[PDB]
Amino acid sequence: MPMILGYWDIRGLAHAIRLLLEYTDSSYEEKKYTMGDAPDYDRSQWLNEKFKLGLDFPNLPYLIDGAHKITQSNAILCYIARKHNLCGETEEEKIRVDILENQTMDNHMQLGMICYNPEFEKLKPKYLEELPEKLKLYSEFLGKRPWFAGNKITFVDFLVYDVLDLHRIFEPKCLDAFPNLKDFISRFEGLEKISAYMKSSRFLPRPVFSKMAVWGNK
Amino acid sequence: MPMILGYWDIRGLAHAIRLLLEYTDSSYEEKKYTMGDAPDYDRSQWLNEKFKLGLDFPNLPYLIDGAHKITQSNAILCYIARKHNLCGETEEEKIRVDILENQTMDNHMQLGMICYNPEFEKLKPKYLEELPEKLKLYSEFLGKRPWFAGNKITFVDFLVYDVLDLHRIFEPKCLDAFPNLKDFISRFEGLEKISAYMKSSRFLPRPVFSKMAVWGNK
Ligand code: NA
């Protein structure tokens, strides 16, 4: 019965999924892949079973729940969310969820691109220069709402939390100009099932990225 | 009052949206922004309006429909699709829709990455070496189904059509090994409203990408 979540033994793209699985009290186990160390960074464990699990578009992370085999982190989150009415009910909520689902991936991928290239320190200045405007848009989108879709928490709160928390690790002061984002993080981490998970042995906040990353590899 | 689709005067990320608006007999008009040529690629036409349209995360394309102001092309597609029950009904359809919404963006962005890269000619051979396996995944996922979510067309058929068609422009023979994908294209282009639109003066198949592209800029 327990679902299987497959991913590298890192935080990465599985962080929001792990948090949502824990928030919804879902029964799951993790299939963990380990990347080899430098200089080769072997990925054989995944690449050689990548095509042996019945996934339609093999990729990490994946979720196996009975006959349902899902890839793409956002499709995984949506699947879990539908089981728990975490998807937005009003048309307004649904639009906000769809926008943020795609926007959070853009901003995550932009950080991933800066952290996997070797000129990271050469490219980091322009990134931090353009970062406050990115966070301001999140802060203004939230405004006075408790959650990003409106009055009710949805799966995109888990995506926005991950994006925000990644950046306060990346730059510790980046949220100081945005008190409503700091309060959002405080309220998210204070949710009973989330707080219990973050204080448990399963909590895997680091490394942020794979061994292949210039930043966040450890 | 027609909806407003705003984008560059190219095919780009708006193709699937244009096709879906046409299939659904939507009332819309297009706000076309023109981009300057190299090396500056002037976008001041967009920049002078970018923050004055009510968009939460200003970006192109956008869709304005009364009070609803939407960015992210997948969010735009979902908004139009919900008006016409084109998002999938059963859980099984919804999973396939969710996977494909994100998978098609992945493959779209992977072609965009090499076509916008200055070393395009250096990178093309390996991309073409890996292309058959990518398309095989779409062919095996479709199987003998008429549409990608199952027995009824959904908005992700428009997304898959665009990615496949982009690649037969890029590599004309690339679908030859996959008859069910060729048949799918025939079915998509054989929809009455798509057929009429493709013969219309509104059809805009080229340029594939923006003026900044190395491949597909004209
Ligand atoms: Na939808």
Author numbering:
A (entry chain D), B (entry chain A): 0 to 217
Which statements did the authors publish about this structure?
Glutathione transferases (GSTs, EC 2.5.1.18) comprise a family of widely distributed phase II detoxification enzymes that catalyze the conjugation of a broad variety of reactive electrophiles to the nucleophilic sulfur atom of the intracellular thiol, tripeptide glutathione (γ-L-Glu-L-Cys-Gly). Each subunit contains an active site that consists of a GSH-binding site (G-site) in the N-terminal domain and a site that binds the hydrophobic substrate (H-site) in the C-terminal domain. Moreover, the isoenzyme GSTM1-1 is mostly studied in humans for its correlation with many types of cancer, while other studies support its pertinence with Parkinson’s disease. The present study aims to evaluate the ligandability of the human GSTM1-1 isoenzyme (hGSTM1-1) using a broad range of structurally diverse pesticides as probes.
